[PDB]
Design an enzyme around this catalytic site. Structure first.
Site, PDB file in Angstrom:
ATOM      1  N   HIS A   1      -4.372  38.965  72.887  1.00 61.22           N
ATOM      2  CA  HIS A   1      -5.462  38.126  72.414  1.00 61.22           C
ATOM      3  C   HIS A   1      -6.399  38.943  71.530  1.00 61.22           C
ATOM      4  O   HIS A   1      -7.056  39.872  71.990  1.00 61.22           O
ATOM      5  CB  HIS A   1      -6.261  37.534  73.588  1.00 61.22           C
ATOM      6  CG  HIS A   1      -5.413  37.035  74.708  1.00 61.22           C
ATOM      7  ND1 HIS A   1      -5.206  35.692  74.942  1.00 61.22           N
ATOM      8  CD2 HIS A   1      -4.739  37.696  75.682  1.00 61.22           C
ATOM      9  CE1 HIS A   1      -4.434  35.547  76.009  1.00 61.22           C
ATOM     10  NE2 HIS A   1      -4.129  36.750  76.470  1.00 61.22           N
TER      11      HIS A   1
ATOM     12  N   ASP B   1      -8.525  34.142  67.636  1.00 61.03           N
ATOM     13  CA  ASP B   1      -9.765  33.395  67.538  1.00 61.03           C
ATOM     14  C   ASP B   1     -10.111  32.924  66.139  1.00 61.03           C
ATOM     15  O   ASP B   1     -10.494  31.778  65.996  1.00 61.03           O
ATOM     16  CB  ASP B   1     -10.921  34.148  68.150  1.00 61.03           C
ATOM     17  CG  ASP B   1     -10.849  34.164  69.662  1.00 61.03           C
ATOM     18  OD1 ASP B   1      -9.856  33.651  70.226  1.00 61.03           O
ATOM     19  OD2 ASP B   1     -11.793  34.690  70.280  1.00 61.03           O
TER      20      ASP B   1
ATOM     21  N   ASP C   1      11.095  33.794  70.874  1.00 65.28           N
ATOM     22  CA  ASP C   1      11.074  33.479  72.278  1.00 65.28           C
ATOM     23  C   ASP C   1      10.689  32.013  72.410  1.00 65.28           C
ATOM     24  O   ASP C   1       9.696  31.593  71.847  1.00 65.28           O
ATOM     25  CB  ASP C   1      10.124  34.396  73.065  1.00 65.28           C
ATOM     26  CG  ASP C   1      10.412  34.385  74.583  1.00 65.28           C
ATOM     27  OD1 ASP C   1      10.089  33.404  75.270  1.00 65.28           O
ATOM     28  OD2 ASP C   1      10.952  35.383  75.112  1.00 65.28           O
TER      29      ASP C   1
END
Lengths: 171, 164
Positions: A144, A149, A6
């Site tokens: 997420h 992270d 994408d």
């Protein structure tokens, strides 16, 4: 193996305008096996209208690489791979144009277009990603995660160690 | 050889809270050689306050393995490695505490804290990963909508080519 693609784009014209975001997932064994995401700084800076539609501003791109440096890296993420995108015709156009324009290459690779496939399998009235997602009853996604992270703190680390390789970095 | 890690937990209390997510990247010669990630089903179910903060739901955790399964695998992914973490005290202590619990091992390993590094190197009003990322110019912090849409499309793809 397949790469599901994408892009984010500077506008609808694949001659003149540029790829400012690429995201991708590699599948084998019917399994996501790894991932690619970057932002890409355009040589033409981004119009008020662009940011408005994309959500992407000049500031987010200001410090990022060029397609000259990102394209070879993304290509090394495929090579062997069948491309897969929703409405792949558009992303794909943009892809092969930009391989030409910067890498010289004449490029072609077979793709599977989830939009077109979904028209074969579904009976729906809009064939958006959101409509086939609800229609299939797929979902709750959690995008997420601890890993994203870990990936940024890792850039943070990397960056610190370059910073501490210069004598008298402490001043 | 390094392993930079980030956990999700049910809470901050060392006496009762569990690790429900592990995220890790393994780094050698300034490059990413490997990645680890799982959810982990807790003995004691996740609260709604925990669901809201972490994004992780009871439903997401039903099918998942337990700590007793995951720790050794994950300790396999570690091994040798220096561990790197941000605000390293919590997450390290937690690891240690749980290797002690499920495995009887007294376990130690050197570690770097990128929050300590930012402190030597930067001078900010905050030392959260968000303020340090902004400063070093490595943002935007957790925008990856195109990966997100690609992960969603992958799952529509997987579904079709397992269908009709």
């Amino acid at each position: 193996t397949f790469v599901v693609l994408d892009f984010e784009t500077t506008g609808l014209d694949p001659q003149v305008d540029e790829i400012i975001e690429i995201g991708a997932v590699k599948i084998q064994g019917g399994q996501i096996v790894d991932e690619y995401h970057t932002l890409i700084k355009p040589s033409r800076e981004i119009s008020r209208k662009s940011s408005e539609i994309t959500g992407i501003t000049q500031e987010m791109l200001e410090n990022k690489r060029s397609i000259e440096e990102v394209l070879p890296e993304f290509l090394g993420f495929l090579e062997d791979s069948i491309i897969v995108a929703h409405n792949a015709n558009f992303d794909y156009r943009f892809l092969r144009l930009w391989i030409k324009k910067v890498m010289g290459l004449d490029w072609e690779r077979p793709y599977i277009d989830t939009l077109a496939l979904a028209k074969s399998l579904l009976k729906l009235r809009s064939y958006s990603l959101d409509s086939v997602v609800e229609k299939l009853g797929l979902g709750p996604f959690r995008h997420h995660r601890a890993l994203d992270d870990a990936r940024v703190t890792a850039q943070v680390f990397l960056r610190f160690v370059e910073m501490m390789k210069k004598e008298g970095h402490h001043h």
